[PDB]
Structure formats: structure tokens, C-alpha cells
């Protein structure tokens, strides 16, 4: 009753170009099977929706990567919030909703937005950059490492931590492995910066700790917490910036309309985020034998959740090839949602927004001038290089 399809979701063609293959695993059915790594896929917005929203059925303390942890040992010990089911989720949630909360954006948002505006107008002076390094990686880098209160030395590892850390959800590929094989020294640097004397006063690893006083955590659960934004924390918001200039330099009447108002920036990087979708799949695990579509998925089954395709479903979403930044976006799954649902989507949202403001206001167009280069990865969707001239406003 369910179709199976070779497809390799995690191929080097697919990350190529997604789109078809997408369309063929929506089209197939609500409910497919993929031969090539023996687990349940969802492309279509209602199933990836019902199967973020139930998750007592469809697990994340089995792993969110293709390996069941049932079987198999974590490559490093589970996230204490994003492998974790409720009850054991929901303590180390609400601390980080809480060291992440509205009421933190108030005390960086002015640094933020000055090191948007900042970085721009260091951009226009040399006209033609690489708005992936020089901009949706060196923005980023300028701002979260001190939020988090790191020192300086050792940053270098935090890109390459985060990669390994999101190509460490995907299958057994030659991406996994060599990600694996490079990893000790960057889960060495990282490990140490999430003990309470390396993160400075004030800062988010800092609060983590703070927190561990109230009965919500213990200190031996902080450094494991600090990890988790040191995974996440990072490497999602380079594509998403990354995503939202990519966006803007193909879509340059949203440019101009984003220009003519510039407090459409928050939503112009919330649709990048539901277009590209830069965290682009997250794996679910059955506890039981369920009904999802109208197959029967056995107990302890792994479940591959296309969130991207699912932010571009037509059955959801109008014209959903379409770059719009006055979309009606609510609802796009590029965060998760549900009791999972990205706890940093405040920062996100703000860097994004400011860095979305101050080309708004500075920029006048952005032009793609040089050879672009996508960046592979198991589970990040996003761009190695993208030359652009920056004509000032
Ligand atoms: C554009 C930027 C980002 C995107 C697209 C993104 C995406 C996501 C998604 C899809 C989830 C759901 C995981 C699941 O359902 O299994 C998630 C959760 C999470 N994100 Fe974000 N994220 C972003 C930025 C951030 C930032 C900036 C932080 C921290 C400062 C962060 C920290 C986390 C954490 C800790 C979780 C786990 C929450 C939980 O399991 O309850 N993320 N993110
Ligand atoms: C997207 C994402 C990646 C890693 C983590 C973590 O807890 O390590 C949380 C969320
Ligand atoms: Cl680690």
C-alpha cells in the first residue's frame, strides 16, 4: 500500500537541486518508503505537521538522525533538549526558553542591530564581496559567540563543530563519516567552553549555569545545555542569513519592495527561512504501530520528516516556489513545530531581522557577479559561496 522509491535524500544530486525529488516524494503518496536507508518518509505539509505534533508516537530520545539510538551508540552524548521526550524534555526546555526569552532579546538587540549596520556599511566600501563569508558567516560570528560569552581563542571550531554536528544526523555517507572522522579536536574545544569558568558573566552559557539553582537543572546538566546552543546556534542562522541574500539577489523586486519598507524585514527573513528551509529534515521514531496517510508504520521505525518540502507543499501553501515577503508565513515548519520547536527562534529572528534591515536601508541592489558554489551537508541546506556587488542606497 505504501511506495517505495529509491530516492537518496542525503545524495549529492539531491542537495543539488531538492525540488523535483521533492515534488516525487510528495506526489508518490502521503507515506513513502526510501530502499536506499530503510525508513518512512513524510514530503507533504499535513503528515510532516501531524508527525511534529505528536510526539509520543513519533519519538526524539531514539535520535533525530537516520541511527535509532536503540541500536546503536550516540556519536556523542544525547542533547539533553533535542533528544529528549517529555517528562525529561520539558525542565531543560523551559530554562532555555527562559535564558532565550523576549525578555533577553531587549538587553542585545541594540548590539546586534549596530553590528548589522556596521557590517554593511563595511561591505559597501569594498563593493564586491562574498556574502557567505563575508556577510551570512562573518555577521553571525561578529555577534553570537559573544552572546554566548565565549573568549576569543578557538572560535575557528564552531563552524566546523556545527557542521559535523548536523551531517552526524545524517546516514552513514562519506559526509557523515569523514565529518566523524575530523571531529575530535572541535568536540574537544567545545566540550570545555560549556564548563560555568569559560563562559563569561552575563552571557547565555552564563545564564545556563544561573539556572541550574532553581530545581529545573543541575549543574552537571548545564554544560550539556550550553552545548546544545553551541550546536544550534551558529551554523543555522549563517543559512539562514545566507538564504534571505541568496533570496534577495534573485528576487530583486523583493529587494526593492523590502527597501520601500524596511519593517518587513522580520517577515522577509521568516518566508527565506519557509524557502529555503535551511534545516532542511528531522528524523522521528515510532514508539508503537501507528496510522499515518493511510499506511500501518510498525513500532520502532524511523521517520524522515522533509520540512522543506513541506514548506513548499502546494496543498499548503500558494504559488510556494515564490519568494514573497509579505506572505502570510505562519505555519512554515522551518523551525519545527510543536513542544520541539526551535527555542531559539528569538535570536534567529532578531539577526536576521536586523541584518535584513540594515540592506534595507544601505543597499540598493544586490548582484550576483561571480560563480556560485553550494555547500553539501547532511542536514543544513545553504550556499559555500556567493559573490555579490553591493550598490549603495
Ligand atoms: C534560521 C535559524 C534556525 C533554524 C532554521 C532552526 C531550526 C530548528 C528546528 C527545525 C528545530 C526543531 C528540532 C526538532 O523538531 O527535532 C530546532 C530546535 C532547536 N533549536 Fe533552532 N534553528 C535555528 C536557530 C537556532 C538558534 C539561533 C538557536 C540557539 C541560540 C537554536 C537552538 C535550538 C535548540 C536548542 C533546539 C531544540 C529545541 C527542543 O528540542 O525543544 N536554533 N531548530
Ligand atoms: C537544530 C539543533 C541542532 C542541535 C541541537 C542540540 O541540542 O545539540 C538542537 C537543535
Ligand atoms: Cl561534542
Not at 552526524?168 to 574545544?189: K, M
Amino acid at each position: 500500500t505504501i511506495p517505495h522509491l529509491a530516492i537518496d535524500p542525503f545524495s549529492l544530486d539531491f542537495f543539488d537541486d531538492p525540488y523535483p525529488d521533492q515534488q516525487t516524494l510528495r506526489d508518490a503518496g502521503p507515506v513513502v518508503y526510501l530502499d536506499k536507508w530503510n525508513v518512512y518518509g513524510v514530503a507533504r505539509y499535513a503528515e510532516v505537521h501531524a508527525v511534529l505534533n505528536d510526539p509520543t508516537t513519533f519519538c526524539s530520545s531514539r535520535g533525530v538522525g537516520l541511527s535509532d539510538f536503540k541500536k546503536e551508540k550516540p556519536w556523542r552524548p544525547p542533547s539533553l533538549i533535542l533528544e529528549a521526550d517529555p517528562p525529561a524534555h520539558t525542565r531543560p526546555r523551559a530554562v532555555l526558553s527562559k535564558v532565550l526569552s523576549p525578555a533577553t532579546m531587549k538587553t542585545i538587540r541594540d548590539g546586534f542591530a549596530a553590528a548589522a549596520d556596521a557590517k554593511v556599511d563595511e561591505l559597501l566600501q569594498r563593493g564586491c564581496i562574498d556574502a557567505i563569508a563575508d556577510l551570512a558567516e562573518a555577521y553571525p560570528l561578529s555577534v553570537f559567540p559573544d552572546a554566548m560569552g565565549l573568549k576569543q581563542e578557538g572560535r575557528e571550531h564552531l563552524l566546523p563543530y556545527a557542521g559535523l554536528v548536523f551531517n552526524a544526523f545524517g546516514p552513514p555517507n562519506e559526509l557523515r563519516q569523514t565529518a566523524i572522522e575530523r571531529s575530535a579536536p572541535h568536540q574537544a574545544y567545545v566540550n570545555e567552553q560549556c564548563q560555568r569558568p569559560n563562559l563569561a558573566p552575563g552571557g547565555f552559557g552564563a545564564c545556563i549555569h544561573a539556572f541550574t539553582d532553581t530545581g529545573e537543572i543541575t549543574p552537571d546538566e548545564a554544560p550539556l545545555l550550553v552545548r546544545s546552543l553551541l550546536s544550534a546556534g551558529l551554523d543555522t542562522t549563517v543559512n539562514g542569513i545566507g538564504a534571505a541574500v541568496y533570496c534577495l539577489a534573485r528576487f530583486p523586486g523583493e529587494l526593492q519592495r523590502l527597501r520601500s519598507d524596511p519593517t518587513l524585514a522580520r517577515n522577509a527573513f521568516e518566508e527565506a527561512v519557509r524557502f529555503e528551509s535551511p534545516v532542511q529534515t528531522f528524523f522521528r521514531t515510532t514508539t508503537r504501530e501507528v496510522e499515518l496517510g493511510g499506511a500501518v508504520i510498525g513500532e520502532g521505525e524511523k521517520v524522515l520528516m522533509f520540512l522543506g518540502s513541506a514548506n513548499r507543499d502546494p496543498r499548503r501553501w500558494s504559488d510556494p516556489d515564490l519568494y514573497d515577503i509579505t506572505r502570510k508565513t505562519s505555519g512554515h515548519v522551518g523551525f519545527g513545530s510543536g513542544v520541539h520547536m526551535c527555542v531559539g527562534q528569538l535570536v534567529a529572528r532578531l539577526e536576521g531581522e536586523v541584518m535584513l534591515s540594515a540592506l534595507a536601508r544601505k543597499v540598493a541592489a544586490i548582484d550576483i557577479d561571480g560563480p556560485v558554489k553550494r555547500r553539501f551537508n547532511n542536514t543544513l541546506r545553504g550556499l559555500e559561496s556567493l559573490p555579490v556587488k553591493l550598490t549603495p542606497a
